[PDB]
Amino acid sequence: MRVLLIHSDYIEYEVKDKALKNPEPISEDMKRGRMEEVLVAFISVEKVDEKNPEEVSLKAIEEISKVAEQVKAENVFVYPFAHLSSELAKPSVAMDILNRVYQGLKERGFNVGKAPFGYYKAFKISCKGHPLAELSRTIVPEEARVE
Amino acid sequence: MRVLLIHSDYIEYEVKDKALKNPEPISEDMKRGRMEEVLVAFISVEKVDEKNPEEVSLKAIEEISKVAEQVKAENVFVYPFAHLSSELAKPSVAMDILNRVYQGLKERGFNVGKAPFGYYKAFKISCKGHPLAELSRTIVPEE
Ligand SMILES: Nc1ncnc2c1ncn2[C@@H]1O[C@H](CO)[C@@H](NC(=O)[C@@H](N)CO)[C@H]1O
Numbered sequence: 616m617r618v619l620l621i622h623s624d625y626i627e628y629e630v631k632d633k634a635l636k637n638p639e640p641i642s643e644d645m646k647r648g649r650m651e652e653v654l655v656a657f658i659s660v661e662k663v664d665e666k667n668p669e670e671v672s673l674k675a676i677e678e679i680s681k682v683a684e685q686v687k688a689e690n691v692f693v694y695p696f697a698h699l700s701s702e703l704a705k706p707s708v709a710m711d712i713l714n715r716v717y718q719g720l721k722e723r724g725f726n727v728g729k730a731p732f733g734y735y736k737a738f739k740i741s742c743k744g745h746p747l748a749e750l751s752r753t754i755v756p757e758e759a760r761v762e
Numbered sequence: 763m764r765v766l767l768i769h770s771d772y773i774e775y776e777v778k779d780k781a782l783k784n785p786e787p788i789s790e791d792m793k794r795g796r797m798e799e800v801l802v803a804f805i806s807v808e809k810v811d812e813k814n815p816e817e818v819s820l821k822a823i824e825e826i827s828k829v830a831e832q833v834k835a836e837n838v839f840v841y842p843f844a845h846l847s848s849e850l851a852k853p854s855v856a857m858d859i860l861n862r863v864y865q866g867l868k869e870r871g872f873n874v875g876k877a878p879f880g881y882y883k884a885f886k887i888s889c890k891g892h893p894l895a896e897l898s899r900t901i902v903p904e905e
């Protein structure tokens with residue numbers, strides 16, 4: 616999994632065309648969204664992640680939480696972004712992992728937002744530009760799955 | 763080299779603290795800048811690129827210019843973005859390579875901008891959201 620962390624003043628998105636023949640169904644309310652004073656987590660689910668989906672999600676929740684604490688962000692935005700990697704995991708698995716992370720983050724008590732999976736989206740972001748406002752993490756499975 | 767191309771309505775940046783002890787010297791005018799209707803090329807130069815700087819540069823110039831043609835973008839902005847890779851090249855080489863890519867695009871007749879190298883920078887961007895508005899490319903030399 617590849618993760619690009621951007622501490623921003625805001626993040627806005629607007630769903631455009633479907634990128635997958637059949638993407639995650641959503642309502643009018645989800646077409647667009649906006650968060651402020653937020654740590655934006657652009658995430659690319661890689662093939663390897665298919666090995667131990669649960670392991671990776673936990674790892675990412677941990678890594679993402681740590682940066683949030685460091686930069687002191689109470690808001691985190693999970694953003695499906697399939698361009699941080701060129702070895703992508705299949706959609707079904709990707710959407711699942713992305714959901715766990717999101718869920719795991721709310722479990723940590725952060726205010727969390729997200730963009731819908733499987734669409735091309737327009738977006739506007741404003742990175743603060745501090746030493747810690749731009750970070751990356753590569754998280755891969757290191758254990759066998761048990762299911 | 764890891765390249766992330768974002769066709770945008772605009773791009774804005776403002777140089778903040780230094781990220782290197784010896785960053786690209788700049789003036790006040792360069793401290794900040796803005797381009798509109800532009801293909802932004804976020805680039806992280808990798809250690810492997812060090813093997814053949816010229817080669818990587820050429821391929822990047824052809825890939826970028828190609829996507830520039832596809833989205834009909836006349837403006838291109840070269841934006842140093844280390845965090846696209848975890849195996850970054852030596853600064854001196856990254857700098858030279860970025861300049862090669864800058865000049866190479868400039869040569870093709872595009873209006874090219876280039877953000878300063880070696881600093882932490884705040885920025886604002888607006889991605890159009892079209893099918894080809896977000897693309898990535900990995901470009902390494904032929905070993
Ligand atoms: N491995 C993966 N990691 C993260 N996201 C993935 C994915 N595979 C599919 N997607 C989702 O499908 C859209 C088109 O690939 C993806 N959309 C995007 O990456 C938008 N930024 C395009 O504008 C995303 O919603």
Ligand SMILES: Nc1ncnc2c1ncn2[C@@H]1O[C@H](CO)[C@@H](NC(=O)[C@@H](N)CO)[C@H]1O
Nearest residue numbers: 781806807842843844850851856880882883
């Ligand atoms: N291999 C490399 N590829 C691209 N850029 C590189 C580099 N090595 C050094 N830099 C420059 O130094 C700043 C801190 O690493 C980098 N700054 C940045 O990546 C900003 N986006 C931080 O806000 C960049 O200017």
